[PDB]
Amino acid sequence: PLGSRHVACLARRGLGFSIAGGKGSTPYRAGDAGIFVSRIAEGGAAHRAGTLQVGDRVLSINGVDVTEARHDHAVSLLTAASPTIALLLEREA
Amino acid sequence: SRHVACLARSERGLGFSIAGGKGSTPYRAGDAGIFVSRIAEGGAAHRAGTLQVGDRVLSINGVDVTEARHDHAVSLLTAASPTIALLLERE
């Protein structure tokens, strides 16, 4: 029961995906300031996992809300050490 | 109230256990829900520090298990997946 949101739970050699947007960086798309998934590498965990899609809004990383976070700080959470990476994502149909 | 848990399935087997569900004995006298009933300490659930004995398992890998059968929830856990994502209630 997560509503219009969904969870990506990836096993942690590189992320396998990139993000764009947030505070301190250029926006992902004109008219929006939030963090979004901006690329998914082929063969990477994210790609084959099929739970990531470019354009997803990144709401939280490893339980840390980033709807108001800086770009490079959201990227630090992603590169920070843990066996997994949890993403709370919100998608547009 | 609601938490997300993301665990890497370790080759030793994942630590936590569950109890309850529509076709088993409850974990808690008057509740038909699915709860994590034990945590093998050392395992992934314990190392992540995100599971708790007593947590109500709401959903498993996007599948709602608030109304499900004990048999089905274990099936969701048992499935050989690289990860397991849990949505818990409390702790």
Swiss-Prot record, chain A:
Compartment annotation: Cell membrane; Cell junction; Cell junction, Adherens junction; Cell projection, Lamellipodium
PTM annotation: Ubiquitinated; targeted for UBE3A-dependent multiubiquitination in the presence of high-risk HPV E6 proteins and degraded.
PDZ domain span: 7-93
Tissue: Expressed in kidney, skeletal muscles, liver, lung, breast, intestine, placenta and skin mainly in epithelial cells (at protein level).
Residues with Phosphoserine modification: 18, 82
Task of the protein: Scaffold protein involved in different aspects of polarized cell differentiation regulating epithelial and neuronal morphogenesis and T-cell polarization. Via its interaction with CRTAM, required for the late phase polarization of a subset of CD4+ T-cells, which in turn regulates TCR-mediated proliferation and IFNG and IL22 production. Plays a role in cell directional movement, cell orientation, cell sheet organization and Golgi complex polarization at the cell migration front. Promotes epithelial cell layer barrier function via maintaining cell-cell adhesion.
Family: Belongs to the LAP (LRR and PDZ) protein family.
Linked pathology: Neural tube defects: Congenital malformations of the central nervous system and adjacent structures related to defective neural tube closure during the first trimester of pregnancy. Failure of neural tube closure can occur at any level of the embryonic axis. Common NTD forms include anencephaly, myelomeningocele and spina bifida, which result from the failure of fusion in the cranial and spinal region of the neural tube. NTDs have a multifactorial etiology encompassing both genetic and environmental components.
Quaternary state and interactors: Interacts with UBE3A. Interacts with PAK1 and PAK2. Interacts (via PDZ domains) with VANGL2. Interacts (via PDZ domains) with LPP and TRIP6; the interaction is direct. Interacts (via PDZ domains) with TJP2. Interacts (via PDZ domains) with APC; may mediate APC targeting to adherens junctions of epithelial cells. Interacts (via PDZ domains) with TSHR; regulates TSHR trafficking and function. Interacts with ARHGEF7 and GIT1; interacts directly with ARHGEF7. Interacts with CTNNB1. Interacts with MAPK12. Interacts (via PDZ domains 1 and 3) with MCC. Interacts with DLG5.
Protein name: Protein scribble homolog
Organism, as annotated: Homo sapiens
Taxon lineage: Eukaryota, Metazoa, Chordata, Craniata, Vertebrata
Full protein: residues contained: 860 to 950 of 1655
Curated annotation (Swiss-Prot), chain B:
Phosphoserine found at: 17, 81
Subcellular location(s) of the protein: Cell membrane; Cell junction; Cell junction, Adherens junction; Cell projection, Lamellipodium
Record-annotated PDZ domain positions: 4-91
Free-text tissue specificity from the UniProt record: Expressed in kidney, skeletal muscles, liver, lung, breast, intestine, placenta and skin mainly in epithelial cells (at protein level).
PTM per Swiss-Prot/TrEMBL: Ubiquitinated; targeted for UBE3A-dependent multiubiquitination in the presence of high-risk HPV E6 proteins and degraded. Palmitoylated. Could be depalmitoylated by LYPLA1 and/or LYPLA2. Palmitoylation of SCRIB by ZDHHC7 is required for its localization to cell-cell junctions, function in the establishement of epithelial cell polarity and the regulation of downstream signaling pathways important for epithelial cell differentiation.
Top-level lineage group: Eukaryota
Disease entry from the Swiss-Prot or TrEMBL record: Neural tube defects: Congenital malformations of the central nervous system and adjacent structures related to defective neural tube closure during the first trimester of pregnancy. Failure of neural tube closure can occur at any level of the embryonic axis. Common NTD forms include anencephaly, myelomeningocele and spina bifida, which result from the failure of fusion in the cranial and spinal region of the neural tube. NTDs have a multifactorial etiology encompassing both genetic and environmental components.
Subunit composition and interactions: Interacts with UBE3A. Interacts with PAK1 and PAK2. Interacts (via PDZ domains) with VANGL2. Interacts (via PDZ domains) with LPP and TRIP6; the interaction is direct. Interacts (via PDZ domains) with TJP2. Interacts (via PDZ domains) with APC; may mediate APC targeting to adherens junctions of epithelial cells. Interacts (via PDZ domains) with TSHR; regulates TSHR trafficking and function. Interacts with ARHGEF7 and GIT1; interacts directly with ARHGEF7. Interacts with CTNNB1. Interacts with MAPK12. Interacts (via PDZ domains 1 and 3) with MCC. Interacts with DLG5.
Family: Belongs to the LAP (LRR and PDZ) protein family.
Protein name according to UniProt: Protein scribble homolog
Species whose genome carries this gene: Homo sapiens (Human)
Residues of the whole record sequence present: 860 to 949 of 1655
